[PDB]
Amino acid sequence: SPLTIKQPFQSEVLFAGTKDAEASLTIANIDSVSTLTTFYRHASLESLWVTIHPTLQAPTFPTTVGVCWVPAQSPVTPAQITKTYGGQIFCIGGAIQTLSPLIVKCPLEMMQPRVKDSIQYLDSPKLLISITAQPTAPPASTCIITVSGTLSMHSPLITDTST
Amino acid sequence: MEIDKELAPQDRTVTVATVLPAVPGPSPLTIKQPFQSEVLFAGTKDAEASLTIANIDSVSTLTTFYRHASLESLWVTIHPTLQAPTFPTTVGVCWVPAQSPVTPAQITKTYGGQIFCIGGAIQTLSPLIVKCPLEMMQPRVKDSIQYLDSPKLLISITAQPTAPPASTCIITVSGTLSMHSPLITDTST
Amino acid sequence: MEIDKELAPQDRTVTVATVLPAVPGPSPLTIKQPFQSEVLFAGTKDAEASLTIANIDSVSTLTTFYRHASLESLWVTIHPTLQAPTFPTTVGVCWVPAQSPVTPAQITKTYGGQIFCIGGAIQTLSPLIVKCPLEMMQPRVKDSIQYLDSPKLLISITAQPTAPPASTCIITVSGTLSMHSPLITDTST
Amino acid sequence: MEIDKELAPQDRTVTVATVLPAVPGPSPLTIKQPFQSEVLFAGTKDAEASLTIANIDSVSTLTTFYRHASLESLWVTIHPTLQAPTFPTTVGVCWVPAQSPVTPAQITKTYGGQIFCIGGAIQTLSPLIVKCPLEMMQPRVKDSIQYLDSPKLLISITAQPTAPPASTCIITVSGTLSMHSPLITDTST
Amino acid sequence: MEIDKELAPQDRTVTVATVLPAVPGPSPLTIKQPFQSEVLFAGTKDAEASLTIANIDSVSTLTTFYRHASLESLWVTIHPTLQAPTFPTTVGVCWVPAQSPVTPAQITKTYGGQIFCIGGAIQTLSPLIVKCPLEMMQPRVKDSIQYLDSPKLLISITAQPTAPPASTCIITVSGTLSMHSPLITDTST
Amino acid sequence: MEIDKELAPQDRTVTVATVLPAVPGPSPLTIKQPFQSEVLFAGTKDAEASLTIANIDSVSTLTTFYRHASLESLWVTIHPTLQAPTFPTTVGVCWVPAQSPVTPAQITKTYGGQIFCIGGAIQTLSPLIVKCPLEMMQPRVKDSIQYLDSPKLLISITAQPTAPPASTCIITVSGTLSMHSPLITDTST
Amino acid sequence: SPLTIKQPFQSEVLFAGTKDAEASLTIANIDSVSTLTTFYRHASLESLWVTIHPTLQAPTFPTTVGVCWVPAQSPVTPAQITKTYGGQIFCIGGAIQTLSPLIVKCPLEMMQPRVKDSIQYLDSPKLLISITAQPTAPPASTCIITVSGTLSMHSPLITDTST
Amino acid sequence: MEIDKELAPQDRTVTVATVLPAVPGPSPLTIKQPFQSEVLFAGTKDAEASLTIANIDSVSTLTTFYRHASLESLWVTIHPTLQAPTFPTTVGVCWVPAQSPVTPAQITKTYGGQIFCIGGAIQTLSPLIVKCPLEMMQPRVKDSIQYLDSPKLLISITAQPTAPPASTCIITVSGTLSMHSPLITDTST
């Protein structure tokens, strides 16, 4: 009933390749998702996926990057991606891993898409990242990792629109 | 026959909250319990308040033995005092859901937000009432979970540079709670 | 054609009182007697009052010859005086059952309770009337039993620091008693 | 499928109480609030209790903000403990209106009065329940007046001459209160 | 029961604006967002303003993610402060299309234009509201084209020669935007 | 033909719980899994327990792969052992919402709460069952939100002063979970 | 509805004539009224009166005895009998005051006859006595004062009937 | 749900009693008064009793103010005590008209007569009730004439050779009298 709008978004979640790293972002808190839902009492994801953009360095420095979508309440960790259902490990900078649409869609049907409500949810989408770089590190990052999607929001939060 | 009461209603818009429905079964009985609590004794110095009605002592005290409780009605009343005529004082009021990050310092930047000159000129002494647009809030003040959008009152006082000897207006919050379902605890106290 | 009186009615809620049922028999003759008693001459100094209507002078002298007496109407009325335009006075008022343990210091913490800024030349000066929600009280001011919830008036006054030469407002309590069943006593006086 | 509960119902007769009816008007809403309170930890020594349910802490605690409250149901439960098997102990129970002058020392002289042997022989360990014949009492536990015939429990313990190391039975009083009509006091606590 | 707000509506006349027609296709999702922005803290010194609503802070930050935005309501409201009873301030107001070449110095020469004497203890002090006759403006505050007649607010203030210590009145602009068709940009912030 | 089980059902009262409503869509596949977990091996020493059913071993291991889990049945059952005829043990039991602040030391002060004298050769020795009045709890043992009123079990044991060589009774909690909506996690184990 | 019984009674309230005296008995508490309502939850007066029995001494020693019935809540005192409505002053031992049926009926319709209930009443019958004797006192009392009446009782009080 | 009471009803046979017929006239007001009197504290030594119900304490004190009194119900009830599980006691009981010349030593020679083994941990301990077959008695416990067949209770006790420290069972007689026609006597006490 309340009018709703949909706003798409792409936020940079992690620049990588220069050193081994792990990440566990609950996408309900990524910058854009936040700046977007600022003036709304309710926000939910319509679509959502992770994407890996390779760079110049990628070719010279192969990088192992694993991603895995999971309900925020899943106890699994980056160290356990290939043990988890969504789990996928790519070899960016590697033979068939230096191409932009290196996408991994998030199975929202497998989790809770509401990212903003009158109540706090336990199973919102959460992303797991696991970068393992070349021992002899690259000058710069071999790939930029971003999270994109669409929010369906409604019911204005009465705050300050000064900014 | 005039009423010594003045209304300064808040601008509204449509925002809805999410509320958990009870598991199907026999309906429990409900009682209503009215309440009035002091919020501030403003006037003597610039001040600001920011209270979440859900946590007001009366609301706590009243809902103690009930698992469920919602706000039937709720408003703020600015009561000018004897010091008010002589010490015009600015009072800012704005109802906002607990989840809105606004601060008293931002009343006039927030949609509903109001600024009142208590005392001073003609008509400035009657009690002001700003009813909370409960429709825009989330009334559930006690439930099986905790909601993030319960009503929250924002107050801001701007006192006269040469302060009055005493507060120029007492500020209270009044309303009615409707509650039910016994919290089965130890009732010895 | 305006009326020289203002009303500041008390927030109410439903709260019944029980009462000794009528004895079977023919209806007794009853009279009604209106009354107005001075309850306070305020303005010159902070002061509080806590009258139990059942015992105010008029109510008392009126009901001495009857065995039963009930209030049919009853209100408190604040009358500003010549000292009022010059000495604003805060006046708090609250009607509660005699059984409510509230003290005038707690008027702004009690549901009904309200406080007014009587006086100030910038202001109004019309007689203020706070009718007692008898529905919430126990109207029986005199019976064969002693009820715990007869109406009780809570008054509170905070005077100007540099007090007026005289009281800024006289406070009277008026109403009408419906009485019957003569009490045999001394009518010498 | 047996229930670990045993009943030892009190002899009755017909006695009625007098109860004040509410003044005609809108009916207030009512809520029920259940309760269980400890009455005695008998067994180690001869003892006797004599409590007026109207004054039990839970009953107080629960009816705090209500002007009216009655007992919907109410009973006593004798709970044998681990010491009971070995230390048979006599327990005397009798419900009586507050106005009856009987004393625990007179249970077996009072019509309803019962004597139970807790622990000892076969069948002596199940929890005993003596429901109060509220019909014979006056249930009003909080009203506009105070009644003289509210329920009153009488207990008498006769311990084994060579006392058990600990109490042989815990004695609690349980029931449900139905209350309504807000006492308009200060709810800050 | 009086409302704490006064209206001083602008003289109008019929003057239409044209507007980019809707593209054929399915109706787009649209939201509405209310807003209140501080436009001026006047009273301490003569000052004039000439806001183009299309660009005020809220309107701007609100419409950044949309490609189309139209005002559904929009008014200016003068809020007297504690410094107001003591420092009357002349405040001029006039709504005109952005295309009208009028300057605040010309408010009293422009049809709609009006000036008010905010403050003075002999006077009123209620929030003044001058709703913008959007019918006369071009409501489209953001589109695929740049209209020449979006609404523009003209403010003018002339302060007391011996200035008040602080501003006598805060001036805010509130309204509601109906927006749609997301503009792809950076949402980092 | 008698059944080897006894029941000591908990006093109940109506007290609903709210619960996250089902998302619109096709009904999800659900399974039900029964369970029995050891909760206590009592008898050898005074001891108390305060289990939150939501977290007992079985309930936990059973619900790890689901995102939603609700109790369909759930009861506690006291099993006397060979040490029981010889060492009577007091065992207190009380079901309360996780939100009730009661501690096992307060079982006899809590409405539902009951205590039994397990053991004694003069007594019975059949398995005692206290089914949890789930109607009073919040059955949702696992959801997208964390409810404050999931069922909580309060156990209390007071052993014979000269303790038995071994436990007099094993205490298990059995029930049936209805689960659905798989939680993606590690199934390695 | 509950079965009721009526029991009549006469209790000695005061022996007098040997010295000046005052008395204010609330008849709800006189001995017999008490022993009678012992086993009842409710008791009310059907009839009630005061009676003055003159004696041997009466003739030799005239005595002034005033009686007056009044609602227990009446503030009047014995000193104010002839000022009160019921009020009557006799001259026992005096010309037409040395005869047994020296009765003064109590106007129950003028007061509250319930003497025992679930609630405490404020206006039950109360008797006022005012004896003023001969300065040269009699050897013994000139008259015995008793209170008689009838109680209508019902609903058994469950106490001890041992006695 | 078992009741804590056992019955051992007396063998009966038809045996009418005649009785003074009602005087012609309007039916007299009658009340009924229940009663329970202690008849014996047995267990510590062999003892016999031979009560004529017409004269037991309660029956006596109850009927002093009436001229007619009839038993409407009347039974004897054996109450085991804490000394009972340990000291079995033989208790003989037999109801006979006052006119029957039987002595407690002859209970087992008298038709109705029965003897019970109260106590013994191997046994039961529930209150034993031997209702008097009033049909066989002459219920008129007080009349204008003295009947020869009012009910008479025969009790017999044979205690354990090594006597218990205290009585093993209290023996009370309860019933209800229907009385009428006041007997003029002294009510001083």
Curated annotation (Swiss-Prot), chains B, C, D, E, F, H:
The keyword Acetylation applies. Pfam families: Tymo_coat (PF00983). It comes from the Viruses. It is found in: Virion. Its main location: virion. GO terms for cellular component: T=3 icosahedral viral capsid. Keywords: Acetylation, Capsid protein, T=3 icosahedral capsid protein, Virion. Gene3D superfamilies: 2.60.120.20. InterPro entries: Tymo_coat, Viral_coat. GO terms for molecular function: structural molecule activity. The modification N-acetylmethionine is found at M1. Self-assembles to form a T=3 icosahedral capsid composed of 180 copies of the capsid protein. The capsid encapsulates the single-stranded RNA genome. A pentameric unit may be lost during decapsidation. Belongs to the tymoviruses capsid protein family. This is Capsid protein. It comes from Turnip yellow mosaic virus. The lineage of its organism: Viruses, Riboviria, Orthornavirae, Kitrinoviricota, Alsuviricetes.
